Design a protein around this ligand. Structure first.
Ligand SMILES: [Mn+2]
Ligand SMILES: [Mn+2]
Length: 324
């Protein structure tokens, strides 16, 4: 009731514009309204398939963004550079909305708000940082406990469990946060059937979708992250052949340029958090795909000013007082 207010218990574009300005000005969304957004978006997400399947007509486009990591001011910049989301300007945010960045609450509630507003044109896919083990140390849990209470965090966690794991555009481009699989023979049929409402297992398809990285050399390698695998071009090739796909778009890896094209064009990385952690000095990018041409078109962007709040401000003391 203090700050932005839902209209008859629903998100509206006026609410969303009010919310973005409220957040821009470093104000807090009332707990009752945050709660409502969370319960309503949980219901929406929990009805979706683990694999979202989207059809883009010849005249339509969609924007694909990678990690945002609580960089809310850079999120708003994406919308200034590329237009707000709507039925004619659809978006996919490819995981890792929270952690590291000190405005994670603002990014996620804005993202859930636009999911409730344009549920068929605003897509959210889970990342590895939409999980408990990462949130407990990399800032999101601490931020939510600081801005709300421990119990709100437990609700965010449960909502994240219902985020779909991948999205397929026109049966030709498959989008997931992390990547492909530690074993051969995984299909789109398998992905659709993943029981995703949980924390990811230590290994297996759900873990890979959120954790794997591409490597340049053929075959697989132990992951640099201690979970899932690195997968080479022949792994990517095999998977696309068996699933009649053209290529994959994934995120999960910081790139100095905000993107990378790997595996002879078959594995595209997109990363949407510029000057990551206020220190990487990287550019970010977003991609456009069109129904008449599903080749990715890259759009690079640089960081913009934000309030004087250091990254990892709500994180593990070990990470918090260890950079800047
Ligand atoms: Mn990630
Ligand atoms: Mn990330």
């Amino acid at each position: 009731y203090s700050g932005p207010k839902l209209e008859d218990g629903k998100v509206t574009i006026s609410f969303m514009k009010e919310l973005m300005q409220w957040y821009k000005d470093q104000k807090k969304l009332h707990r009752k309204c945050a709660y409502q957004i969370l319960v309503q978006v949980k219901e929406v997400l929990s009805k979706l398939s683990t694999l979202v399947e989207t059809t883009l007509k010849e005249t339509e486009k969609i924007t694909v963004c990678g990690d945002t990591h609580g960089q809310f001011y850079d999120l708003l910049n994406i919308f200034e550079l590329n237009g707000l989301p709507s039925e004619t300007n659809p978006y996919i945010f490819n995981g890792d909305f929270v952690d590291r960045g000190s405005f994670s609450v603002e990014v996620i509630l804005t993202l859930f708000g636009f999911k409730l507003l344009y549920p068929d044109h605003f897509h959210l896919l889970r990342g590895n940082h939409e999980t408990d083990n990462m949130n407990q140390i990399y800032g999101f849990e601490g931020e939510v406990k600081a801005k709300y209470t421990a119990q709100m965090y437990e609700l965010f966690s449960e909502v994240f469990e219902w985020l779909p794991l991948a999205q397929c555009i026109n049966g030709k481009v498959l989008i997931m946060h992390g990547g492909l699989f530690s074993e051969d023979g995984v299909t789109l049929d398998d992905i659709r059937k993943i029981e995703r409402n949980r924390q990811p297992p230590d290994s297996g398809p759900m873990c890979d979708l959120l954790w794997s990285d591409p490597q340049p050399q053929n075959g697989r390698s132990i992951s640099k992250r201690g979970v899932s695998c690195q997968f080479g071009p022949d792994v990517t090739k095999a998977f696309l052949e068996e699933n009649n796909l053209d290529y994959i778009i994934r995120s999960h890896e910081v790139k100095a340029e905000g993107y990378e094209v790997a595996h002879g064009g078959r594995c595209v990385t997109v990363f949407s958090a510029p000057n990551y952690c206020d220190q990487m000095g990287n550019k970010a990018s977003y991609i456009h795909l069109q129904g008449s041409d599903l080749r990715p078109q890259f759009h690079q962007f640089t960081a913009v000013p934000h309030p004087n709040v250091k990254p990892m401000a709500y994180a593990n003391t070990l990470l918090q007082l260890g950079m800047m």
